[PDB]
Amino acid sequence: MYSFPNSFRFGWSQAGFQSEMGTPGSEDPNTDWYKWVHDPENMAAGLVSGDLPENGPGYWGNYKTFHDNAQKMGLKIARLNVEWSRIFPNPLPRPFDESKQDVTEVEINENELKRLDEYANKDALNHYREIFKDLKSRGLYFILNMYHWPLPLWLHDPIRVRRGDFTGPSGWLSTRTVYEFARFSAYIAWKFDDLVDEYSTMNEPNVVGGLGYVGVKSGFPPGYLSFELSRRAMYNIIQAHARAYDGIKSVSKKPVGIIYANSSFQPLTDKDMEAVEMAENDNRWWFFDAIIRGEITKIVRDDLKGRLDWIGVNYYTRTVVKRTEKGYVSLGGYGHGCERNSVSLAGLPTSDFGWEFFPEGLYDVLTKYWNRYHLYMYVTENGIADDADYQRPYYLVSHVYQVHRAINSGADVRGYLHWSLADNYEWASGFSMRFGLLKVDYNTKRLYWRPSALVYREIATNGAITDEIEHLNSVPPVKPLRH
Amino acid sequence: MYSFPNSFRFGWSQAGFQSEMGTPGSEDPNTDWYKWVHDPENMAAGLVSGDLPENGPGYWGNYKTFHDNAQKMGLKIARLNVEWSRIFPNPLPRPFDESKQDVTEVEINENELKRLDEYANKDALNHYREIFKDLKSRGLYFILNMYHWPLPLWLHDPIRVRRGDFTGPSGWLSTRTVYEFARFSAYIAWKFDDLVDEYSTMNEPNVVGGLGYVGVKSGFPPGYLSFELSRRAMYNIIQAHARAYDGIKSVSKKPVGIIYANSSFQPLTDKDMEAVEMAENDNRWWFFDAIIRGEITKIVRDDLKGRLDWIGVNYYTRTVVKRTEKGYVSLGGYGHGCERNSVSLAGLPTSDFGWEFFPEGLYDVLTKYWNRYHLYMYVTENGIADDADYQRPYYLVSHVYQVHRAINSGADVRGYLHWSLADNYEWASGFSMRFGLLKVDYNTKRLYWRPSALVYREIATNGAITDEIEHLNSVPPVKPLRH
Amino acid sequence: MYSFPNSFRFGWSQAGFQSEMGTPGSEDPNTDWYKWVHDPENMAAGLVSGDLPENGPGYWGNYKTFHDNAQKMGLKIARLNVEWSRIFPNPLPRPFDESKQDVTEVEINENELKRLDEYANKDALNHYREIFKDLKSRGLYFILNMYHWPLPLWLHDPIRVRRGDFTGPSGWLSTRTVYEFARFSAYIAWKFDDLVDEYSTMNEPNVVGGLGYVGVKSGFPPGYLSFELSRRAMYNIIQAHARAYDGIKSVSKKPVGIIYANSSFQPLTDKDMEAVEMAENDNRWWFFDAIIRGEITRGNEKIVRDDLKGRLDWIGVNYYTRTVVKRTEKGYVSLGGYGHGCERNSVSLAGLPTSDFGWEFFPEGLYDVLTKYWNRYHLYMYVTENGIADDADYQRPYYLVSHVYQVHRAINSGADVRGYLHWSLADNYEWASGFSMRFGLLKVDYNTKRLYWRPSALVYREIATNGAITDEIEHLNSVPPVKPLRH
Amino acid sequence: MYSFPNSFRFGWSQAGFQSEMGTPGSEDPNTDWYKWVHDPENMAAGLVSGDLPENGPGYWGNYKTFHDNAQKMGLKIARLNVEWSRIFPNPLPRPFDESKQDVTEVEINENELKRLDEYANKDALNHYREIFKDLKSRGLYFILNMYHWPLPLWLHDPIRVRRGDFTGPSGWLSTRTVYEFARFSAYIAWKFDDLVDEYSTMNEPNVVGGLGYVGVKSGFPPGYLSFELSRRAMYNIIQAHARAYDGIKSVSKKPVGIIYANSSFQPLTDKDMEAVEMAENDNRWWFFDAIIRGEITRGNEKIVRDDLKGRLDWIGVNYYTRTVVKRTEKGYVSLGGYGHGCERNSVSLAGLPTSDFGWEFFPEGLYDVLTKYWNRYHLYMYVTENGIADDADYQRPYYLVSHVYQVHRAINSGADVRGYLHWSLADNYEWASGFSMRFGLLKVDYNTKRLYWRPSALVYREIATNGAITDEIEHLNSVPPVKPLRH
Ligand SMILES: OC[C@H]1N/C(=N\O)[C@H](O)[C@@H](O)[C@@H]1O
Ligand SMILES: OC[C@H]1N/C(=N\O)[C@H](O)[C@@H](O)[C@@H]1O
Ligand SMILES: OC[C@H]1N/C(=N\O)[C@H](O)[C@@H](O)[C@@H]1O
Ligand SMILES: OC[C@H]1N/C(=N\O)[C@H](O)[C@@H](O)[C@@H]1O
């Protein structure tokens, strides 16, 4: 067996936009993402799937069922977010000089929170309180995340921006968003601190800036291709993180961290180890050096330094890189860039999404963070698109083993949260990518236990990979799978 | 949910030759099958795999572990056989006219059993008693089968016969075997009646005669190609069944049945329904009409009539047939005649063994037997070769559902026994075909729970296909599998 | 045997941007498409492959070898374009009210032509003359096409437009481009008419407008997503075609047609026949009714323009695969998993093999397309493109024979089809996809620029030299066996 | 370019039983193989496919058409056999001590030949003359082979032997067959020497003995499993070859060789080179050392037989794929998943594509086999068979060019190789597998008996007419791309 520390918790992560809608009464039309996936032109271009989130798994109405299943599964931790748009669906009075590059301080006090109070949707707040109380009643430790991608439409009209029009609400391109995000975060902590165990400001800010402004074929808002604007967005979201951290801490003593999108950077040949380090700097260290050490672009900002208590590690697969004349490049045919339901250039099985099986990468990522910063971590996402459940039992057990391995090496990792408890709306890809331990019938909103859920219940209830399921710490056999 | 009657039992079947050996001390070199798979010429011809049963899962030594796992899995029934060769490894004194075609009576009484007693291996008998006592102590209902293919070498030297030499011990071609089988069966019931709940005389006599003397590419002993001798073997094994039934009943009041190899015969087109009936007559009814009604080839034998209390239905897949000028033919590309790890001509997934997914066939077979004979049934075998466990969760739930369906239609089916609890020696194919709910590491003899075992535990402990696993009553998705 | 009329020609089609560059001194850096595929942001987004056209098959320098192989293969017809950008690399003097929606007339006279002649690149002109004279010396009948997608940069900066900046050169969004295209076409006809047998104004305007402004994941310039701007570009390209036809006719008596991208629209179920007609209207008839019958929609009204009516002598049918459509509450939709929307090197939802590009094998659609055009307009046709992405040459022998058979079938039904031009003689630069998609009868080694005959080229030679699908290769009129192929 | 010597010939090989029947009046029901494939028990066991040779490509009636296509394809050599059973359908008079292990001499003189002539079927003889004269009229050099597996039923009843009854005609288990084969070969030479350029005594004796008595799942007659009887049959077939060589030489001055089934033995790891040598000894050298050097094992002793020594003028190299071997405690073993032991239409354990028959693409092995024979014996060779089961023709263009290149390489290294004969010109009856395995350059429609040129036939014509792999097809000297193929 592989036994975990008595305090280690197994659980799951999910997001508001992806899971909440589906039950009549749950509809939240007020985000950039809602508008984006309903857009006629985006649909015709195939940038979005045509599936709509209001036809979703219905966590808003059915949360008690989700929680019942999580409890039966032996889970002891959950990470979810509140949707900003639900709490503040209408524009807030403008506060503050918008032309200033840096946002070093956002003053938040009791009076200001009471004023914000008057703009908040009370029905939304009460409902979230009901969801989280039910969550806590199952013995679930609660990590509350403030943001998992959708912005209020009054902060970002993504179609205007796609069209090249920067005169409207411009999302992460505007310091007004940084300012309001800080206040929103403080406001939520102020309202929910009694229920929350730990906080995250944000989920994967690198993906928001990266796919929003560079990887435009991904169909992420606002899909405006610009290196310069991707930089500006990332700069703003970093400041937003720091200002949200200060805002939360003005109102709570609880740990505040951040959740980030990771890949394990692997050398194509033994001559590519420098390329790996350059990739890690460019995709990981530059960001965390900003919010932990205050290092940014080359100065030190005291308002950025030390704004992090813990690191949420999301991990799915690797990225293979090679050294280049001018620098380095990532290679197609490995990691996230494989054919769906096939095999990578290394002969490793790929998921319904075309992502390569590579659990060793998780050990790489956890130990590298630990060695650099010595901040404790949760694995906040790890899972696989696999409606049939062919690969998931292996994917699950193998990655859990790599976590045990990281802890064995000295890394302080305090939980593993699978993505996800149930199938949900996979962004521009729609419902066809199914990540759940539980299968969703979208017609009836019924949840079914895929065999991996029975496997995870084994792990969670025992706090270990048991002797009986240890064989799943291996690669899915490729011979019976599609090539 | 699909709930079964309170008296219905879920369990498993296994065979002595396939599971017993593997632990030092368990070796049984005294069968036709042992000699057959060790034969240098058979190995060079590829008729046998080259794997040897003494390197097996080791039920002989490890039975307590098998039973522990079965109990944890919620199983309540088991069907196993004693190996004839273990109990009588040495030739018995010749009794009886060998030239007579019919064996209508075998006189067995107390004195004769006491005499046989003096030739029996006491160590083997005591060991089986230990295995079965442990089995009963887990709350397992016990179906004891007398025969599952290997014969004592002193009754059958299969290499001599393969070579065309009929002067030696000739197995089912000799009425001496019919005579000794009747006595052996009576002897075992006499020794074990206190432990046994129900009896089977034989496992799949049609396969012994069919592959032994016609389907010679299967590498089954003695591999002598002869329509005439296949008929003679089948004639003898039928009489053997009847004489074993009388012999058991001379010593016990408990139910005595037989286990038979079934296929669901399906019409290629709607013009082939006559072909189906001809196939069913030729492969099923002729045999059961002999041992139930005494009808044989065209007379009635009173010594054959009514020799059956129950029917063991083994079922894996269908056979597609078409009408022919001269009669009917079976079609390649369906049922058992598909490519391994692929798809049939109907687009249905095939197993590691090349067998087509067709659970509806089981409903067909159970209801047809019920309607003809009105004898109660157990599903004595059903399973799939699937080391990876990709298809098994679906195979398991789908077939269990078809049993529920048969019962719903009025058929008296009293249990479902999966083939098998753990991986074992798949005859001429060796160890590579893995049918277990539990995976065997043959190096250490350790057993692991494949996810289907967790699924089966759900079914068995609840006496139902539960709401949560009901989605597995479907065909494995073929898109992610090999074509 | 399937024998063709004695006058029928077998040949090939090729485009300037895709095949010219690759030999020393052949580079043409002056187009929208050149800038588009070199753009750092386009490359990082994966909109373009990273492959560059200047590393291509080298027709500019190696044309004699291309033509040697075409002659050896028994080909008797070719359709190529001149690249506008090579002839006019620098801007011409502003002539004309850019605010006017319609361009009903473009006056071109001999004096105007002689002025234009002062701005034309003479080396480029002379080189094209050398290429075309060699072509004609092989006994190849010559269809000269004026345009096959790239525009001079001075007429379109696609990066600016991608960024949503409409103050610069805007390509088909500007009537200036319409005006200049007319003059350009008249000019090329004026200079080359002695070498040309028939003219086409343009290749697949519907793709330029459709992928440029709607199908933006395709990585075609300017990649600005706008239904309204797609409509505007299509409106301009239609009037450009008409003005180019009048311009060519002012200087030549020869036939002037257009080449258009076709799909065979097929009903998912027997209840989807209406859906097909609606798709045919929306993707085909609306365009050809504008340039043949003068019928068109301007803003929100349905009018006849006398300046558009009758501007077409022949139709170039480009055809690769079908589109499967189904009827919807609000209209019709096309279905993934058939036609061009399949997995690469696999099988469609109908069990038909797909190409290296994920396009479904459906030769029957060529019969559908040819006979439908014939019955509507009764204008003669050439099949101006038909071919398959297939480096290994597994499917091409079947693809070629089967589609050629379908043209024999169309003629048999009464359709006036005068030739079949395979895409392409050799591998070339497949737009945003780069070099990996190989459509050639001849394989190109891009390192040495050497050409190799795939077995389909030997098959094609059998067809062309005999003017028939011979008895000996007739079995290739069938679907490539799927069992040995990837699924 | 890979150019061959001016004297080198490209051609094909074909067998009587596999190609002759299919036309009215061509049936030969009088062989062991005919009875074997019609046998009800063999059919029900799946030992044989159920396909029947009398439904075959019809060379007996259509030979002129076969030869027309071979001439069109530029072929200059052919190797065929006469079927023994057609010439002597009824038993001959018993001559000779059947209990003697060795047959050191078979006296044949002109008087004996004239007596044999009284029993020969004259219609069959005249028909073969007609076939062979037509063959020679195409400029085809003629290798006549005496035997390619089927024996007259009066010499072998394979069902009896399958049943373990050795009292009837026992085929290669009886010296009577050795004795009669010698007379038969002398006889055919006597009758046909004016038409023949070179002779082979037999095709692949090692397969006859090996699959007949050991590899019994292959469904080859008599399918009686016995190491000892396999040894006995191989011993007899060896002496039959020697006696047939002396018999032919008594009547002809022409070269007399033998055709043998080859595999290239390859080491799994660098520690398996000894294993290869042992496999080469056991599967190849032991046989050829008997008939060239007279070295052999009788019962349990190693002797030189003067009556076996030097009975060979040339070696026919048949080659399809490799065998991968590894060293074992007790010796060596060959490995599944490489060579002929792969899944059909898939990839081997080495990632190389497999044929319709599950045979791995390994042209390098032909170089290995040719040079090894050359270095051991210094006898000239023809590649007498090489080809692939491939109905679709996906892999054959690569298979053909690559193996032909390997023969060019062998000659380059000094090996005297005088021709390459593809198996086969057209599809035919593949033994126990039936018609489904298609090896032809030409595809056969078995309903009409029409022949079609697969693209590989056009490729082969390029090679044969030029006497070279030309520059234009040189890219086919490569492995078929696996990505678009089934795995
Ligand atoms: O793609 C799976 C999963 N992965 C994610 N990042 O990699 C997102 O956080 C989550 O919203 C998404 O659903
Ligand atoms: O082939 C699976 C299984 N199936 C069986 N019959 O179909 C045999 O009873 C059993 O011994 C064998 O292992
Ligand atoms: O996609 C192949 C081919 N097909 C075309 N239309 O479909 C284009 O005219 C041509 O430039 C392109 O290369
Ligand atoms: O298996 C193809 C071919 N190969 C052969 N040896 O390998 C035989 O001589 C020939 O008869 C057979 O048809």
mmCIF file of N, CA, C and O in Angstrom, chain D residues 222-269:
data_model
loop_
_atom_site.group_PDB
_atom_site.id
_atom_site.type_symbol
_atom_site.label_atom_id
_atom_site.label_comp_id
_atom_site.label_asym_id
_atom_site.label_seq_id
_atom_site.Cartn_x
_atom_site.Cartn_y
_atom_site.Cartn_z
ATOM 1 N N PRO D 222 0.085 -34.290 -45.422
ATOM 2 C CA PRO D 222 -1.103 -34.968 -44.886
ATOM 3 C C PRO D 222 -1.517 -34.505 -43.513
ATOM 4 O O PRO D 222 -2.434 -35.091 -42.954
ATOM 5 N N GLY D 223 -0.837 -33.499 -42.951
ATOM 6 C CA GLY D 223 -1.215 -32.970 -41.644
ATOM 7 C C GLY D 223 -1.148 -33.978 -40.528
ATOM 8 O O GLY D 223 -2.031 -34.004 -39.648
ATOM 9 N N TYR D 224 -0.107 -34.800 -40.556
ATOM 10 C CA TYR D 224 0.150 -35.803 -39.532
ATOM 11 C C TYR D 224 1.342 -35.329 -38.727
ATOM 12 O O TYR D 224 2.449 -35.209 -39.259
ATOM 13 N N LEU D 225 1.127 -35.096 -37.437
ATOM 14 C CA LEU D 225 2.127 -34.464 -36.582
ATOM 15 C C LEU D 225 3.188 -35.464 -36.107
ATOM 16 O O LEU D 225 2.912 -36.316 -35.284
ATOM 17 N N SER D 226 4.409 -35.325 -36.614
ATOM 18 C CA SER D 226 5.507 -36.269 -36.294
ATOM 19 C C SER D 226 6.860 -35.702 -36.654
ATOM 20 O O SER D 226 7.180 -35.529 -37.833
ATOM 21 N N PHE D 227 7.662 -35.396 -35.646
ATOM 22 C CA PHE D 227 9.042 -34.997 -35.908
ATOM 23 C C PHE D 227 9.749 -36.068 -36.740
ATOM 24 O O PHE D 227 10.386 -35.758 -37.741
ATOM 25 N N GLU D 228 9.639 -37.321 -36.300
ATOM 26 C CA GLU D 228 10.308 -38.447 -36.993
ATOM 27 C C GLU D 228 9.863 -38.576 -38.446
ATOM 28 O O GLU D 228 10.711 -38.774 -39.329
ATOM 29 N N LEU D 229 8.559 -38.446 -38.718
ATOM 30 C CA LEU D 229 8.129 -38.558 -40.118
ATOM 31 C C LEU D 229 8.500 -37.352 -40.949
ATOM 32 O O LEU D 229 8.764 -37.492 -42.145
ATOM 33 N N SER D 230 8.578 -36.172 -40.320
ATOM 34 C CA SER D 230 9.074 -35.005 -41.018
ATOM 35 C C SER D 230 10.513 -35.252 -41.474
ATOM 36 O O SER D 230 10.849 -34.919 -42.588
ATOM 37 N N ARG D 231 11.337 -35.830 -40.605
ATOM 38 C CA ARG D 231 12.746 -36.163 -40.942
ATOM 39 C C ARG D 231 12.827 -37.144 -42.098
ATOM 40 O O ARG D 231 13.592 -36.939 -43.041
ATOM 41 N N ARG D 232 12.013 -38.198 -42.016
ATOM 42 C CA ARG D 232 11.927 -39.199 -43.084
ATOM 43 C C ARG D 232 11.517 -38.559 -44.403
ATOM 44 O O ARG D 232 12.136 -38.813 -45.427
ATOM 45 N N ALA D 233 10.482 -37.707 -44.398
ATOM 46 C CA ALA D 233 10.101 -37.081 -45.653
ATOM 47 C C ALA D 233 11.208 -36.182 -46.206
ATOM 48 O O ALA D 233 11.398 -36.104 -47.407
ATOM 49 N N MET D 234 11.902 -35.447 -45.340
ATOM 50 C CA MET D 234 12.955 -34.549 -45.838
ATOM 51 C C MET D 234 14.111 -35.370 -46.436
ATOM 52 O O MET D 234 14.656 -35.034 -47.470
ATOM 53 N N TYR D 235 14.452 -36.470 -45.779
ATOM 54 C CA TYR D 235 15.496 -37.373 -46.279
ATOM 55 C C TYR D 235 15.149 -37.894 -47.685
ATOM 56 O O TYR D 235 15.975 -37.856 -48.601
ATOM 57 N N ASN D 236 13.914 -38.334 -47.870
ATOM 58 C CA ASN D 236 13.449 -38.805 -49.185
ATOM 59 C C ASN D 236 13.403 -37.736 -50.253
ATOM 60 O O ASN D 236 13.822 -37.963 -51.407
ATOM 61 N N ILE D 237 12.918 -36.547 -49.888
ATOM 62 C CA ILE D 237 12.848 -35.468 -50.864
ATOM 63 C C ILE D 237 14.251 -35.007 -51.310
ATOM 64 O O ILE D 237 14.448 -34.632 -52.470
ATOM 65 N N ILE D 238 15.214 -35.048 -50.389
ATOM 66 C CA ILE D 238 16.622 -34.761 -50.728
ATOM 67 C C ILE D 238 17.143 -35.771 -51.782
ATOM 68 O O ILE D 238 17.696 -35.389 -52.827
ATOM 69 N N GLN D 239 16.964 -37.058 -51.513
ATOM 70 C CA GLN D 239 17.435 -38.058 -52.486
ATOM 71 C C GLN D 239 16.639 -38.026 -53.788
ATOM 72 O O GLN D 239 17.215 -38.194 -54.884
ATOM 73 N N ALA D 240 15.354 -37.678 -53.692
ATOM 74 C CA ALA D 240 14.554 -37.457 -54.895
ATOM 75 C C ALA D 240 15.130 -36.332 -55.736
ATOM 76 O O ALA D 240 15.126 -36.409 -56.970
ATOM 77 N N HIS D 241 15.605 -35.267 -55.084
ATOM 78 C CA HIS D 241 16.153 -34.156 -55.844
ATOM 79 C C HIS D 241 17.400 -34.633 -56.618
ATOM 80 O O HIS D 241 17.564 -34.331 -57.794
ATOM 81 N N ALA D 242 18.285 -35.322 -55.920
ATOM 82 C CA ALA D 242 19.543 -35.836 -56.488
ATOM 83 C C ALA D 242 19.269 -36.783 -57.667
ATOM 84 O O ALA D 242 19.856 -36.652 -58.733
ATOM 85 N N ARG D 243 18.336 -37.706 -57.470
ATOM 86 C CA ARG D 243 17.969 -38.663 -58.508
ATOM 87 C C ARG D 243 17.288 -37.956 -59.673
ATOM 88 O O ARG D 243 17.524 -38.289 -60.830
ATOM 89 N N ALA D 244 16.480 -36.929 -59.399
ATOM 90 C CA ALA D 244 15.911 -36.143 -60.496
ATOM 91 C C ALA D 244 16.999 -35.344 -61.250
ATOM 92 O O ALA D 244 16.944 -35.201 -62.452
ATOM 93 N N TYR D 245 17.990 -34.826 -60.538
ATOM 94 C CA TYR D 245 19.082 -34.117 -61.231
ATOM 95 C C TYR D 245 19.818 -35.080 -62.213
ATOM 96 O O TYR D 245 20.001 -34.754 -63.392
ATOM 97 N N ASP D 246 20.201 -36.260 -61.726
ATOM 98 C CA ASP D 246 20.878 -37.265 -62.579
ATOM 99 C C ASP D 246 19.995 -37.687 -63.759
ATOM 100 O O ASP D 246 20.465 -37.809 -64.908
ATOM 101 N N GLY D 247 18.701 -37.870 -63.474
ATOM 102 C CA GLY D 247 17.735 -38.210 -64.499
ATOM 103 C C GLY D 247 17.630 -37.167 -65.579
ATOM 104 O O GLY D 247 17.613 -37.508 -66.762
ATOM 105 N N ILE D 248 17.547 -35.888 -65.195
ATOM 106 C CA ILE D 248 17.470 -34.804 -66.181
ATOM 107 C C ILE D 248 18.780 -34.724 -66.980
ATOM 108 O O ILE D 248 18.766 -34.543 -68.204
ATOM 109 N N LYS D 249 19.896 -34.845 -66.274
ATOM 110 C CA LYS D 249 21.204 -34.730 -66.908
ATOM 111 C C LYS D 249 21.441 -35.882 -67.912
ATOM 112 O O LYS D 249 22.215 -35.725 -68.855
ATOM 113 N N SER D 250 20.780 -37.026 -67.705
ATOM 114 C CA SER D 250 20.921 -38.177 -68.621
ATOM 115 C C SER D 250 20.333 -37.824 -69.984
ATOM 116 O O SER D 250 20.669 -38.439 -70.998
ATOM 117 N N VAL D 251 19.510 -36.777 -70.016
ATOM 118 C CA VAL D 251 18.752 -36.431 -71.198
ATOM 119 C C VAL D 251 18.970 -34.968 -71.681
ATOM 120 O O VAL D 251 18.528 -34.579 -72.774
ATOM 121 N N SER D 252 19.625 -34.150 -70.857
ATOM 122 C CA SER D 252 19.782 -32.722 -71.169
ATOM 123 C C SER D 252 21.135 -32.182 -70.691
ATOM 124 O O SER D 252 21.679 -32.669 -69.688
ATOM 125 N N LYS D 253 21.659 -31.176 -71.401
ATOM 126 C CA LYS D 253 22.886 -30.483 -70.971
ATOM 127 C C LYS D 253 22.615 -29.217 -70.131
ATOM 128 O O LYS D 253 23.546 -28.645 -69.548
ATOM 129 N N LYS D 254 21.341 -28.809 -70.067
ATOM 130 C CA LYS D 254 20.935 -27.540 -69.466
ATOM 131 C C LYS D 254 21.086 -27.475 -67.939
ATOM 132 O O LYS D 254 21.200 -28.513 -67.266
ATOM 133 N N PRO D 255 21.171 -26.262 -67.379
ATOM 134 C CA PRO D 255 21.379 -26.130 -65.934
ATOM 135 C C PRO D 255 20.176 -26.661 -65.120
ATOM 136 O O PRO D 255 19.015 -26.466 -65.526
ATOM 137 N N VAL D 256 20.483 -27.339 -64.016
ATOM 138 C CA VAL D 256 19.475 -27.930 -63.149
ATOM 139 C C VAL D 256 19.701 -27.476 -61.717
ATOM 140 O O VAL D 256 20.741 -27.755 -61.118
ATOM 141 N N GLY D 257 18.713 -26.780 -61.167
ATOM 142 C CA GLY D 257 18.828 -26.275 -59.812
ATOM 143 C C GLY D 257 17.632 -26.679 -58.964
ATOM 144 O O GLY D 257 16.908 -27.654 -59.295
ATOM 145 N N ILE D 258 17.436 -25.954 -57.863
ATOM 146 C CA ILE D 258 16.310 -26.208 -56.960
ATOM 147 C C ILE D 258 15.844 -24.862 -56.353
ATOM 148 O O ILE D 258 16.631 -23.902 -56.251
ATOM 149 N N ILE D 259 14.583 -24.796 -55.961
ATOM 150 C CA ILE D 259 14.020 -23.576 -55.388
ATOM 151 C C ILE D 259 13.679 -23.894 -53.936
ATOM 152 O O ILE D 259 13.082 -24.928 -53.639
ATOM 153 N N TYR D 260 14.077 -23.011 -53.023
ATOM 154 C CA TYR D 260 13.960 -23.276 -51.600
ATOM 155 C C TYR D 260 13.340 -22.089 -50.853
ATOM 156 O O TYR D 260 13.595 -20.941 -51.233
ATOM 157 N N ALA D 261 12.565 -22.375 -49.793
ATOM 158 C CA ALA D 261 11.888 -21.332 -49.003
ATOM 159 C C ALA D 261 12.844 -20.721 -47.986
ATOM 160 O O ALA D 261 13.414 -21.414 -47.129
ATOM 161 N N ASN D 262 13.016 -19.414 -48.086
ATOM 162 C CA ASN D 262 13.993 -18.727 -47.234
ATOM 163 C C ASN D 262 13.396 -17.702 -46.317
ATOM 164 O O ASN D 262 12.451 -17.002 -46.666
ATOM 165 N N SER D 263 14.017 -17.578 -45.162
ATOM 166 C CA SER D 263 13.744 -16.468 -44.279
ATOM 167 C C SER D 263 15.103 -15.859 -43.875
ATOM 168 O O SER D 263 16.124 -16.563 -43.833
ATOM 169 N N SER D 264 15.134 -14.543 -43.648
ATOM 170 C CA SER D 264 16.371 -13.895 -43.176
ATOM 171 C C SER D 264 16.367 -13.944 -41.668
ATOM 172 O O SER D 264 15.471 -13.393 -41.033
ATOM 173 N N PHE D 265 17.342 -14.635 -41.084
ATOM 174 C CA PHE D 265 17.365 -14.818 -39.654
ATOM 175 C C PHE D 265 18.079 -13.642 -39.008
ATOM 176 O O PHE D 265 19.222 -13.330 -39.376
ATOM 177 N N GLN D 266 17.366 -12.980 -38.091
ATOM 178 C CA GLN D 266 17.815 -11.726 -37.500
ATOM 179 C C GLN D 266 17.873 -11.861 -35.983
ATOM 180 O O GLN D 266 17.001 -12.492 -35.390
ATOM 181 N N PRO D 267 18.895 -11.274 -35.355
ATOM 182 C CA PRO D 267 19.082 -11.402 -33.900
ATOM 183 C C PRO D 267 18.181 -10.418 -33.151
ATOM 184 O O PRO D 267 18.148 -9.244 -33.515
ATOM 185 N N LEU D 268 17.454 -10.884 -32.143
ATOM 186 C CA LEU D 268 16.641 -9.987 -31.335
ATOM 187 C C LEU D 268 17.527 -8.879 -30.718
ATOM 188 O O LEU D 268 17.228 -7.670 -30.860
ATOM 189 N N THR D 269 18.624 -9.301 -30.081
ATOM 190 C CA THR D 269 19.615 -8.404 -29.466
ATOM 191 C C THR D 269 21.001 -8.726 -30.009
ATOM 192 O O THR D 269 21.199 -9.762 -30.678
#
